[PDB]
Design a protein around this ligand. Structure first.
Ligand SMILES: Nc1nc2c(ncn2[C@@H]2O[C@H](COP(=O)(O)OP(=O)(O)OP(=O)(O)O)[C@@H](O)[C@H]2O)c(=O)[nH]1
Ligand SMILES: Nc1nc2c(ncn2[C@@H]2O[C@H](COP(=O)(O)OP(=O)(O)OP(=O)(O)O)[C@@H](O)[C@H]2O)c(=O)[nH]1
Ligand SMILES: Nc1nc2c(ncn2[C@@H]2O[C@H](COP(=O)(O)OP(=O)(O)O)[C@@H](O)[C@H]2O)c(=O)[nH]1
Ligand SMILES: Nc1nc2c(ncn2[C@@H]2O[C@H](COP(=O)(O)OP(=O)(O)O)[C@@H](O)[C@H]2O)c(=O)[nH]1
Ligand SMILES: [Mg+2]
Ligand SMILES: [Mg+2]
Lengths: 190, 430, 430, 430, 430
């Protein structure tokens, strides 16, 4: 299967969007599942700043400071609080225009293209490796041998099983012979 | 329905058998006359009404010790005709007690063994005691083991041999018969425990604070070790261990079954109660190299497997918390191919005290049976002592003239060389 | 109806059963003399699940006790509630296995198992509608891990459609009491995956950790570990013996917790657990139960459940409570921990409510979760096994009774394949 | 609805909470066993603000207690009303911080905070409609001032729209109990301004002054200071738990008392306060309450409020009284003191009336005023900080745990900038 | 869950350890046999049933004092094998106890330390006692500190060293080993407290009115100081202080950690009750130069930081009212870069009295630990004494012949010169 150039980019951007939507620290008690589903499909200001920080854009110049990003977010966000996937794309384009604002010779399209190269969005593995959390464990009240143990199971492999394989066929033939000998003993004792 | 038969041969064997048989009778409440004024069944048998008879047999060619036994306070306990006695001593000559005078006595002993075995229904195994550096002891022990290995087969036999000290010695010819007896029991005994006298002398001097010990003090400690080993068969415990559950846990390979023991605590009543005797400190003292019951340094070799018994009010979690501390220490290192090497047993009955003895009454004790690679030093030094006199063929005429062939000395030397090579081959990491 | 029989083997299994049956009898108000003295009508309606009826109005458990040595069953009979067991069901040998898997599975366990299979067949053929069998045994011992697992295959061959439970204690490397634990653990895991419909691993190390940290009692003993295991065992089948809002037998749990037939190794935990001094401070509420239920330290295994992702989970609430609160709390524990739940199977938590709480408690919860974090136990067991096997240590004991190294190689390969294919689904994504 | 959860940290915060919860329970008629025994219907209508409901009808506070050492929580449990707290909410470490801010914020506080954040998230996700959080901690200690402030940032990052309260005790230079107070005070004020929606400073010196001068009791103790702080704490949220003429939640106060987002440091006071011997002389009237409310010695801070001009003020009257009198008295207290009120914001006093008075009192008032006189506390704190820092005294303790002097320089600069820009509006004119 | 281990080495160390261990046993109600007829856990450990074992170890090469301990009334208290004893004394030679005979004993002490540490779970730190002017004391203290600093690392160690008096001396060679030991513990100990005998003699003479004191009277006062320092860990208090909360409050720089102590009140029962012993007068007496526990004049130098502990029924406001008075006085001046220098702790348990002792029973007491610039005088006078004999190389042959190099004396002199320069550099105002 394949995706369009803006979309492959669009597919990778959607993957980043869906990842950061799930990082939201939702404040409040006893939510509806509709609200939880809504909040999983939108990015808040904190998660958008986290995205810009992890991609090394936040506070890099005077046009991408925490305050400037907050003003931009309130101006372009849905309900002044939330970004959907389309508003997230628009916000990244606005951040690209702000981030490269001092480069007068660049068109707005070239500024967005330069930002997409800067975040390495065309390489899904490098793009995904920049995704960072906020926090979770799986609820487990936590606190010489800690270093990890990669139990490399011995390949009972094509060369190794071969004898073992040959051995399974031999063992089946021996069991069939023992059944035939038990049947022949039952027939010869009969 | 679980039984065990103990064999005592030679002067040292009989003198340690006396030591263990005061302790067992005291521990089971049986008076010296044999009369009580269901745990006894492991060592004793009921006669129907009244007295109990030990499942033990005493062997010797020299009659003095048996006559001393048959006139002491324990004259009424033992069956009159299981104290087999000879007329002529082997006189420290191994060839005598294996070829000349032991053969005419061994048949009566085997008949007694059969008569005792037919009574038992759940026979766990045999115990044997013999001081190695003597003629009759080593020779008759070898002959009895060789006969039993074919009469019964797979039954387990345990040997509590007393090897000579590194430098302290009573005889002058004991390396010869020690090497020959090691040859004989290498392929014939399932477990052999080291018991040389010098280490136990040092233990008594340092802990018991006795400056003039005699053989009885040594034999009492050995008896306590035996009681600690066999307590699990006759008392209720949270984590039991049987005799047959040893070659599966302490014996990595059929050739390697020589291990050395230790015991803790050893302390007198004058200063025992001033300290709390926690489980951690006793299990630390048990692993101290100076408290080994055989004069060998465990720091010179790796460990292979450690089987160590507790008794008293010890709790398993405290035992685990102390095994972890020992695994932590950098001065004790185990062999590479053994990740876990500890077998733990816990029993509830505290050790019993013998009146007029040295040890005091305590609520916790630990006995360890540890198999280590460092044991090869005693074999090497015994071999060096043997070679010095075998170079000039000294004292050989006392052995050739008793029916033994000339070449019999060489093959024992070859088997010791093979054992020493095997111990080196096992201890190298992969 | 839909009742199950109890079969236990080995010393550890016998000690577990000796407390499990005490707990069941106390729950149903049965005196140690077999006479009912309960208070509520519901205490007798479904007593046919575990107890049979005999003349004179007394009740007898349908338990079968087997071991290769008579000591443990001769000891459990003298304990409390020891008279309930029918003397005919006691089957034992005269030799024992000595922690050797080969002896308890090929030479000695094969000849004896006919007698115990006779009584097993007698018990199963008679009962109204069979639900299945539950097995308690230890993987750290020879006779248990051999005879129990061979009996599993023999039972499965004759009743392929019934359900089979096994509560298995695996040897942890922290608290090791036997040196040959890896061999008979690895050999047993090979056979256990092929026949057991459900398996529940329990570790002594986790029990000590729980007793020391949550209950905060000074001196844990085997009685406390047995009591915790017994409470966990009873919690699973509670709704099968009592009415409730959503009854759920063992087969319903089998359907909902096993995605693929080879992934049936669960780890469990019981809540609430509080210290004596803090039992008045706490208030029993559904949030308080569910927060302790998913706590990592509360699991009966040392495996860390936040080192992997749950494939599925189950909870068996006890007592009278509102279902809306239970469902919303289950949803909340799954929304706040989405990282530790596999994403290609939505709504992977099963809940059940039983209106009869344990005696003395108003609410209780039993947790059974199938998680990918269990791989770490097999990893360390195989690591120790391959560290010890490469030198062929202690191999002669097993090879002297008809077994060979090929069965060791196949067992290691199958265990490693299980380890690999169990984590294969951890990295799987939709 | 619109309820809040309680989170406290450190020894001082735990001692404040131990009296705050006693006061709340006495107000709502909850016995120390969690059983309601109140008299009025209104005592139960809005109990969901602070208390949760569990099975058996008892109530449990939604408080979370955290500290780096277990002593204080092990002591508060044995005090009165100590059983109400859920044992699951107690989280503690085994090391402590030793009044070192770096240890309680970088090395030790970072690893532990995950467990407390888990229970914090559990509490907030569940509740009907969140209003916000209130925090009690001390700026004079290491573990408190570190872990509490880092927890503030962590909570703010996840709930940016909720409201956050902090009751902070700052170290006064008069009564000094720790030599390293300026360092962790200055470091904490840096982080506290960036995240806390409201902050309320409390000083031990002002509490001693009040106890000695107004109540005139001979021997003040921490119990009296805690009781005054607890009464002041309860007075703020009274109208959120009871009906009244003009209800005003915390968010309404946040709107009306904070002109600019960085000016949210208030000082409070409680009226009436009278001695035991003069409690019969005085008559409780609105003029008597309002004259004591604006009294300089009545403020809970040593800051002198006639050394600056109020930006705004708030009053929360309790009891049944006429609103016309309250409004005219508020106007009169603002016409007679026009010099101490900033002129470019007219009508800068907020009033509220709640019809339910405190138990035992017929009228009560809680005062929360944002004044420019608070600059003096930061001035003296920074003066001591720069006197101690210029020689790099005690700096190695902080720099040995990953912290550097650059974070000290930035903190000092930001604190001085706050001091300057807070007084910038004092000289501002229209 | 908070523990501390005390180390006693040398004759003076053992004789002050005896003094502190009567006091602790008396204060916790434990009889001399160790049996009671949850605060004990700081100094003791529970054995499961009955007696308590101190967390202390006694070291000496000369056996007389240990033998006296093992026969007194406290023979049953201490564990028998933690009273490590040598055979040959160092005989006031520092090189002996650091290079010749101490090395063979230090391994056993380190093994005991490990065995005691594995039991503790919340180890706060170590305490060590040693008289500096002796061979074995100084040498073994240096070696133990050097081993512990690398075995454990960041754990805190406190040293209660007894330096020689300005003019009164018992030996003739004690300046040499005093200087060497100061070199050794300068870079290895976190806290060092001054304890010379002459000041305490003057205290006894002036206050206790004893004209013929012995060492026991001195050791009882030292024991009382230790108890006052460690009371906050095992008793409830309004303002707690931990051991780890010291280097953040009393140690401005890593090199400067020598401070001198004082105690108040010190008074006999014959005239104690005639005066009220208010907090103000006791806190005035504690700051009197004549009541310093080390013979140094605080009027000759500045103060750096004062940490001072109260216990009894003292109220914090009275403490603040007395700290203000001390700040007022013109004869006590603090360093410029320290605006506040007081750390205050308050505890509720009054000091306990030892029967037959000197001190009477009082309800209020104060113990101060103060770091001052005036301490350089003792270093200067010890240096002057050292130089006089090192000019002619007297007594050096007794040290060169015990393995120590010739140049080792010079570098200790250079480190003392560096310390004296550092003390002068710190005390100058900016
Ligand atoms: N531990 C211990 N060893 C002993 C005792 N008696 C003798 N031995 C050792 O036994 C060695 C010699 O063998 P013995 O047992 O004395 O004599 P034997 O075994 O009967 O052999 P014969 O000399 O032929 O009678 C000596 O080197 C001793 O070290 C004893 O009572 N206790
Ligand atoms: N305060 C106090 N000081 C003591 C006491 N006993 C000895 N000292 C001091 O210790 C110094 C000498 O060291 P000691 O403790 O006596 O002997 P040591 O430390 O064991 O060193 P060795 O001489 O090698 O045994 C003397 O100058 C005394 O001032 C005591 O009981 N109390
Ligand atoms: N929970 C519990 N575990 C036990 C008990 N007794 C023994 N065990 C465990 O069982 C293991 C030894 O099993 P073993 O007795 O040899 O089994 P067997 O060979 O079938 O008799 C040890 O590692 C113990 O941890 C008990 O009473 N309770
Ligand atoms: N009001 C009040 N203040 C206290 C109490 N206990 C201690 N404090 C104050 O807290 C300060 C010390 O804080 P600290 O205990 O070190 O906080 P921690 O480091 O978080 O444990 C002192 O200056 C005291 O004034 C108390 O019971 N009540
Ligand atoms: Mg003889
Ligand atoms: Mg001395």
């Amino acid at each position: 299967k394949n995706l369009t150039k803006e979309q492959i980019r669009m597919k990778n951007l959607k993957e980043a969007f869906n990842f950061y939507c799930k990082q939201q620290n939702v404040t409040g008690v006893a939510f509806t599942f509709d609200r939880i589903v809504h909040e999983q499909n939108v990015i808040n200001l904190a998660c958008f700043m986290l995205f810009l920080k992890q991609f090394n854009i936040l506070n890099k110049n005077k046009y991408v400071t925490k305050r400037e990003i907050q003003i931009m977010f309130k101006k372009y966000a849905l309900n002044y609080k939330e970004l959907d996937l389309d508003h997230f794309k628009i916000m990244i384009e606005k951040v690209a225009i702000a981030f490269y604002k001092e480069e007068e010779n660049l068109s707005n399209i070239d500024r967005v293209e330069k930002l997409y190269q800067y975040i390495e969005i065309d390489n899904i593995h490098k793009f995904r490796s920049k995704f960072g959390l906020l926090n979770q464990p799986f609820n487990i009240q936590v606190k010489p041998f800690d270093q990890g143990r990669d139990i490399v199971l011995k390949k009972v492999d094509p060369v190794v099983r071969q004898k073992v394989k040959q051995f399974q066929e031999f063992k089946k033939s021996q069991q069939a012979l023992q059944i035939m000998q038990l049947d022949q003993k039952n027939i010869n004792q009969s | 329905m679980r039984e065990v038969i103990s064999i005592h041969v030679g002067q040292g064997g009989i003198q340690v058998g006396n030591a263990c048989w005061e302790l067992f009778c005291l521990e089971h409440g049986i008076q010296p006359d044999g009369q009580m004024p269901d745990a006894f069944n492991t060592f004793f048998s009921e006669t129907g009404a009244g007295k109990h008879v030990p499942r033990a047999v005493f062997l010797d060619l020299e009659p003095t010790v048996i006559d001393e036994v048959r006139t002491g306070t324990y004259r009424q306990l033992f069956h009159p005709e299981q104290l087999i006695s000879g007329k002529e001593d082997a006189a420290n000559n191994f060839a005598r007690g294996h070829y000349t005078i032991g053969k005419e006595i061994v048949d009566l002993c085997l008949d007694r063994i059969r008569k005792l075995a037919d009574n038992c229904t759940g026979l766990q195994g045999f115990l044997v005691f013999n001081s190695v550096g003597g003629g009759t002891g080593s020779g008759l022990g070898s002959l009895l083991l060789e006969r039993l290995s074919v009469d019964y087969g797979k039954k387990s036999k345990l040997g509590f041999t007393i090897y000579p000290s590194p430098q302290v010695s009573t005889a002058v010819v004991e390396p010869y018969n020690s090497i020959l007896s090691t040859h004989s029991l290498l392929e014939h005994t399932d477990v052999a425990v080291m018991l040389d006298n010098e280490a136990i002398y040092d233990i008594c001097r340092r802990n018991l604070d006795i400056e003039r010990p005699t053989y009885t003090n040594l034999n009492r400690l050995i008896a306590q070790v035996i009681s600690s080993l066999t307590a699990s068969l006759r008392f209720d415990g949270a984590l039991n261990v049987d005799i047959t559950e040893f070659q599966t846990n302490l014996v990595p390979y059929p050739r390697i079954h020589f291990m050395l023991s230790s015991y803790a605590p050893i302390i007198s009543a004058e200063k025992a109660y001033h300290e709390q005797l926690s489980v951690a400190e006793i299990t630390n003292s048990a692993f101290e190299p100076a408290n080994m019951m055989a004069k060998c340094d465990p720091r010179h070799g790796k460990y292979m497997a450690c089987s160590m018994m507790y008794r008293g009010d010890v709790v398993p979690k405290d035992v685990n918390a102390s095994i972890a501390t020992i695994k932590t220490k950098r001065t004790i290192q185990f062999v590479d191919w053994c990740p876990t090497g500890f077998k733990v047993g816990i029993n509830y009955q505290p050790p019993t005290v013998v009146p007029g003895g040295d040890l005091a009454k305590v609520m916790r004790a630990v006995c360890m049976i540890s198999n280590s690679t460092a044991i090869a030093e005693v074999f090497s030094r015994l071999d060096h002592k043997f070679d010095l006199m075998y170079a000039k063929r000294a004292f050989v005429h006392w052995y050739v003239g008793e029916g033994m062939e000339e070449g019999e000395f060489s093959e024992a030397r070859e088997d010791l060389a093979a054992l020493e090579k095997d111990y080196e081959e096992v201890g190298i990491e992969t | 109806m839909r009742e199950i029989v109890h079969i236990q083997g080995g010393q550890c299994g016998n000690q577990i059963g000796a407390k499990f049956w005490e707990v069941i009898s106390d729950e149903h108000g049965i005196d140690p003399t077999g006479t009912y003295h309960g208070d509520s009508d519901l205490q007798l309606e479904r007593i046919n699940v575990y107890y049979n009826e005999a003349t004179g109005g007394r009740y007898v458990p349908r338990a079968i006790l087997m071991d290769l040595e008579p000591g443990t069953m001769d000891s459990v009979r003298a304990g409390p509630f020891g008279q309930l067991f029918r003397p005919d069901n006691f089957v034992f040998g005269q030799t024992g296995a000595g922690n050797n898997w080969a002896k308890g599975h090929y030479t000695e366990g094969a000849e004896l198992i006919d007698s115990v299979l006779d009584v097993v067949r007698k018990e199963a053929e008679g009962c109204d509608c069979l639900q299945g069998f539950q097995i308690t045994h230890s993987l750290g011992g020879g006779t248990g891990s051999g005879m129990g697992t061979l009996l599993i295959s023999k039972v499965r061959e004759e009743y392929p459609d019934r359900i089979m439970e096994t509560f298995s204690v695996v040897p942890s490397p922290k608290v090791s009491d036997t040196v040959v634990e890896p061999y008979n653990a690895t050999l047993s895991v090979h056979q256990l995956v092929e026949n057991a419909d459900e398996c529940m691993v329990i570790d002594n190390e986790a029990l000590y950790d729980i007793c020391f940290r949550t209950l905060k009692l000074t001196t844990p003993t085997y009685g406390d570990l047995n009591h915790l295991v017994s409470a966990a065992m009873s919690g699973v089948t509670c709704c099968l013996r009592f009415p409730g809002q959503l009854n759920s037998d063992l087969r319903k749990l089998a359907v909902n917790l096993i995605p693929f037939p080879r992934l049936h190794f669960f780890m469990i935990g019981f809540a609430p657990l509080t210290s004596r001094g803090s039992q008045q401070y706490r208030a029993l509420t559904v949030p308080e139960l569910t927060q302790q239920m998913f706590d990592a330290k509360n699991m009966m295994c040392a495996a860390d459940p936040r080192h992997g992702r749950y494939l599925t989970a189950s909870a068996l609430f006890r007592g009278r409570m509102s279902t809306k609160e239970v469902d919303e709390q289950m949803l909340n524990v799954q929304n706040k921990n989405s990282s530790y739940f596999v994403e290609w199977i939505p709504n992977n938590i099963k809940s059940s409510i039983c209106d009869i709480p344990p005696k003395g408690l108003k609410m209780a919860v039993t947790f059974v979760g199938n998680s990918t974090a269990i791989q770490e136990m097999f990893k360390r067991v195989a690591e120790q096994f391959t560290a010890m096997f490469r030198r062929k240590a202690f191999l002669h004991w097993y090879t002297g009774e008809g077994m060979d190294e090929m069965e060791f190689t196949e067992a290691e390969s199958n265990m490693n394949d299980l380890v690999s294919e169990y984590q294969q689904y951890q990295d799987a994504t939709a």
